[PDB]
A paper describes a structure:
The [name]-1 Env is a trimer of gp120-gp41 heterodimers that are heavily shielded from the host immune systems by N-linked glycosylation and further protected from neutralization by conformational masking and considerable sequence variability. A glycosylated region near the base of the third variable loop (V3) of [name]-1 Env forms a supersite of vulnerability that is targeted by antibodies originating from diverse germline genes in multiple [name]-1 infected individuals. Here we used cryo-EM to visualize the interactions of a complete inferred [name] clonal tree with the co-evolving virus Env.
Well-resolved density was also observed for the V1 loop N137-glycan, which contacted the I2 heavy chain S84R mutation site. Re-orientation of the V1 loop shifted R57 toward the V3 GDIK motif, resulting in its interaction with D325. Similar mutations occur in the I2 intermediate, most notably an F101C mutation spatially adjacent to the LCDR3 base that results in the formation of an additional disulfide bond in the antibody between residues 91 and 101. These included the VL Y93F, A94G, and S97A that work in concert with VH G110Y to cause a rearrangement in the LCDR3 region, creating a pocket in which the N301 GlcNac-1 N-acetyl moiety rests. An important impact of the improbable HCDR3 G110Y mutation in creating this pocket is the shifting of the F93 rotamer via steric occlusion.
Author numbering:
A (entry chain K): 196 to 248
B (entry chain K): 84 to 135
C (entry chain F): 34 to 139, 150 to 185, 185a, 185b, 186 to 309, 312 to 321, 321c, 322 to 354, ...
D (entry chain G), E (entry chain B), F (entry chain L): 512 to 547, 569 to 664
Amino acid sequence: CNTSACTQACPKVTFEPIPIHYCAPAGYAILKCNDETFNGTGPCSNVSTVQCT
Amino acid sequence: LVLGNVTENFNMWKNDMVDQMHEDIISLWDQSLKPCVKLTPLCVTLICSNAT
Amino acid sequence: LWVTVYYGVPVWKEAKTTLFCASDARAYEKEVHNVWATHACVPTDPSPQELVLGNVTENFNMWKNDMVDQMHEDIISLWDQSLKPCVKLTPLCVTLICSNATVKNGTVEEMKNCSFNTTTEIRDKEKKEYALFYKPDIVPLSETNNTSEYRLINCNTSACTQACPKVTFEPIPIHYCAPAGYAILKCNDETFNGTGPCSNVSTVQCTHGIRPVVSTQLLLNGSLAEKEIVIRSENLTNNAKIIIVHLHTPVEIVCTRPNNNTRKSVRIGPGQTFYATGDIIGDIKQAHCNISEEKWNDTLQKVGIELQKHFPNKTIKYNQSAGGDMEITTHSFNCGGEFFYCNTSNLFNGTYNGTYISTNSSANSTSTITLQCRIKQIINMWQGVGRCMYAPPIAGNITCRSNITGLLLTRDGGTNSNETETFRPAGGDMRDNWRSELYKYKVVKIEPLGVAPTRCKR
Amino acid sequence: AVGIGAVFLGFLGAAGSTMGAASMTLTVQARNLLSGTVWGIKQLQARVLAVERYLRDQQLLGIWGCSGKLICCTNVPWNSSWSNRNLSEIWDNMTWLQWDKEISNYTQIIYGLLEESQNQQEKNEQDLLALD
Amino acid sequence: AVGIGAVFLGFLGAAGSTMGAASMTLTVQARNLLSGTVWGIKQLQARVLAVERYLRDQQLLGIWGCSGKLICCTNVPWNSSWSNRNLSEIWDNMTWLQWDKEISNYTQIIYGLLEESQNQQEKNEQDLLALD
Amino acid sequence: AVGIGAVFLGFLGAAGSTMGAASMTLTVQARNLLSGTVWGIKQLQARVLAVERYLRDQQLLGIWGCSGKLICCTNVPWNSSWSNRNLSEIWDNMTWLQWDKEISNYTQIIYGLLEESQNQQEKNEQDLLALD
Ligand SMILES: *[C@@H]1O[C@H](CO)[C@@H](O[C@@H]2O[C@H](CO)[C@@H](O[C@@H]3O[C@H](CO[C@H]4O[C@H](CO[C@H]5O[C@H](CO)[C@@H](O)[C@H](O)[C@@H]5O)[C@@H](O)[C@H](O[C@H]5O[C@H](CO)[C@@H](O)[C@H](O)[C@@H]5O)[C@@H]4O)[C@@H](O)[C@H](O)[C@@H]3O)[C@H](O)[C@H]2NC(C)=O)[C@H](O)[C@H]1NC(C)=O
Ligand SMILES: *[C@@H]1O[C@H](CO)[C@@H](O[C@@H]2O[C@H](CO)[C@@H](O[C@@H]3O[C@H](CO[C@H]4O[C@H](CO[C@H]5O[C@H](CO)[C@@H](O)[C@H](O)[C@@H]5O)[C@@H](O)[C@H](O)[C@@H]4O)[C@@H](O)[C@H](O)[C@@H]3O)[C@H](O)[C@H]2NC(C)=O)[C@H](O)[C@H]1NC(C)=O
Ligand SMILES: *[C@@H]1O[C@H](CO)[C@@H](O[C@@H]2O[C@H](CO)[C@@H](O)[C@H](O)[C@H]2NC(C)=O)[C@H](O)[C@H]1NC(C)=O
Ligand SMILES: *[C@@H]1O[C@H](CO)[C@@H](O[C@@H]2O[C@H](CO)[C@@H](O)[C@H](O)[C@H]2NC(C)=O)[C@H](O)[C@H]1NC(C)=O
């Protein structure tokens, strides 16, 4: 009431983290780096292609 | 599907997938709270004693 | 001979479509939702260049175009969209007890010092607040025995949303572009009246930057005609048509509010505020506009001679506006945040007999015509738009300095076999502000499939 | 054939020229029928209003045996009542933009006389293969 | 092989006729696969669903070398287990609507025998041009 | 040509191979350019972005007379400054993915040299049919 008005979260909706697959549209592809020692930045020498993560 | 002799550069810290997923989760979480009750008559003075 | 079909044929048919918006790149360096142009419009580029065509002669017309009505609908819906997240007021329909706003041991004639009981963020508790309100925003409450109790000019018809202080009313130019499969034909004739054939036509993808300037009785910051003052009407015989005069050279008008206002925030409800005028820190002065007298007299004599082109034996008289409500009979515009409503009876008072008088041998070269303006905040702006808006005050004095490039005249009714045929300013339908800018452009559908006979046989 | 394109005259630069000169430049008008950007729900239709039109022009030329963006001549006889004009007074002075004003009254039944069956000479060709 | 187009029989008037009679009037079913108008967000999808389907049928016929709306005869050998029927008892009495009930179980593996090698015969044409 | 199709290698399985091996498999990359399903206004764009990008590739190959998804060889002369390499050191060891890094800087002006003269040879074929 000093900054905003809170809406109550509905009791019939849940906060459960159902997994989400992110997919590229047609004409695009998703490259997955399969290196087990991968730091996260740089070249990957074992790459696959996937539609949905 | 594993590919051939391809070597491909990857990077996390300037990806666009993570920012788009953050925007999607923000907008979807905002969308889920639209039909719910907004309270508002709960900004009254609350006289709060000890909950013995 | 045999029939033979061709694909890629330059053949046109004028048709309706949904043109879209393009804005220049530097506005995208600003934040989102400041102006509606930078939020979602596409980035324009000078690569779709203006391309002059061959020996094409193409008919153009203003008064039944579809671009002007579509632009009017877009500006209505976009300005409606910009007011959705803003505060809707609603606890400001309380009784206002308005005493005299005696600013430092002297009264002001335009502002009332209205005090009212606001509900705070704690809805069972209330606090007394005060604000200085302009008298066009304030109506006395009823016929009851109390002359000190007033009311907002709303709550009888609608509830006004306060315009957000982080959005701006600055007219960023808008480029209207046709979709793929359509083209925009631009008439390049300098002597073009606006109706009829054009013998110098070009094709463009995106139109030139149109300023969405909202103004009555004058046209501000518009485009200028190339070689002469052009007078446009649907038919000059009918009195009820607004005569749009397009000036070759602009006349600079400078407008100001001198008194040093301040901004005071009143917290109404949970987490939203109402911005109003507090004290006036200084002395009380008149808000006004200034036009150079010699240049305005010269401009009125020139409008006289190209009005005398259509009325050959008669003189030309200018009279003041027809009167009525202040939103109709006054030059209404936006001087950088504050809505000015200026009195124009000093400008349109004169006549031209047929002989041109040069501006030399003047009494003084710095003589100025000064118009006295009122300022509003509760803006009954349009219809079907969320029809009103409270414009929050801005601190400090304000000035703006702009160019007059057009006029919106209207001839009086025909009587007395009159030698003068007098003209008055007019306004109230906003399409005529944007019809004077979309006079060169038309949209055409490409029909690229054609049929011709030749000696080819399959 | 040759795998090459268009001319530098721009989208409608051949308008106002002859039918021979606008029998050139035909690639340029055909290339500029598709584009894409975003201004929301008012512009999204302005996306698909391209494609919904463009494939329509790929329908009729796909039917008439033309199958592309090119000159396509037929063996359907030209009725003389449509123009009553010879070839040299059509092709060397007239413009396509003003030829359409004369022909568009009749283009429905010219398309209408380009009807019944291209399919039968997709059968006769098959009769050249299966039977002969 | 001719300029002409579709016949006046209407969208599905050849349904219920023979296979030979529905080998004609193919142009009419090919013609009526695109249209456009407006009823908002429910109908805007009904715009794009007209396109997503249609280009799919322009995919496969472009894959197989057919490249149009026509009869396209190939040289993949017909396995006799698919129909076990001669030509005259297929084409002269049966309907496409009931022929599809017999062939639609096998159309995927027919596409699985239209599966492997068009690109190498495009390469064979390129070898006939370049090497020969 | 032959009436067959794709390969079984999947969408990008030929990446990393030679130009000869990726001159095969070309049908699969051309077949997976269209799909359709629904996740609202965010995904509806992902529908039309499938089409607006596809038909553009059907524009240029329609401009150059290729008119399909195939090997299309021209007779525009190759300027030697673009690669400065012979045939066998391109086609037997190099990948398309790394050939594009060498050809992409000049691809715009190659398409510019693919923008002169298709319309005049369609007029020339009309001259070969009509005048000859
Ligand atoms: C947080 O704060 C709350 C208030 O802000 C507080 O609630 C209050 O708690 C006090 C303390 O217990 C109560 O005061 C006591 O009430 C009893 C009444 O008990 C008899 O009546 C009930 C029905 O209640 C009715 O009467 C009350 C008082 O007049 C009214 O307010 C109420 O609206 C009703 O009309 C009845 O069910 C009882 O019978 C049960 O119990 C007997 C044994 O006692 C059993 O044999 C029987 O089978 C049955 O189970 C009983 O007859 C009174 O006698 C006391 O003198 C005292 O006044 C308040 O009533 C109560 N107020 C409210 C609004 O609830 C919360 O307790 C507190 N919570 C925490 C965690 O701190
Ligand atoms: C418009 O109308 C509003 C009211 O509707 C006017 O506001 C009132 O103006 C009068 C006239 O100046 C004020 O009355 C005077 O207050 C003097 C107090 O000055 C000393 O206190 C200051 C702090 O103010 C406190 O005290 C006042 C009075 O008790 C309270 O009301 C306040 O809420 C504060 O608690 C110090 O800063 C200062 O240094 C002084 O020591 C007092 O001495 C006078 O006798 C007289 O009562 C009145 O306080 C104003 N009320 C409000 C709510 O602002 C306003 O001026 C009008 N404006 C115009 C332009 O017309
Ligand atoms: C403005 O006028 C008022 C009213 O005269 C002045 O205020 C009062 O003046 C009277 C006598 O003039 C005294 O009895 C009071 O003590 C004054 N009250 C206050 C609060 O000053 C006032 O001084 C004048 N000037 C200003 C600047 O307000
Ligand atoms: C507020 O007022 C001051 C002085 O009244 C303005 O300062 C003048 O601004 C003009 C602008 O053209 C200059 O020509 C003058 O030299 C300035 N000084 C003086 C003493 O007049 C000031 O511009 C005003 N504020 C705004 C925002 O316009």
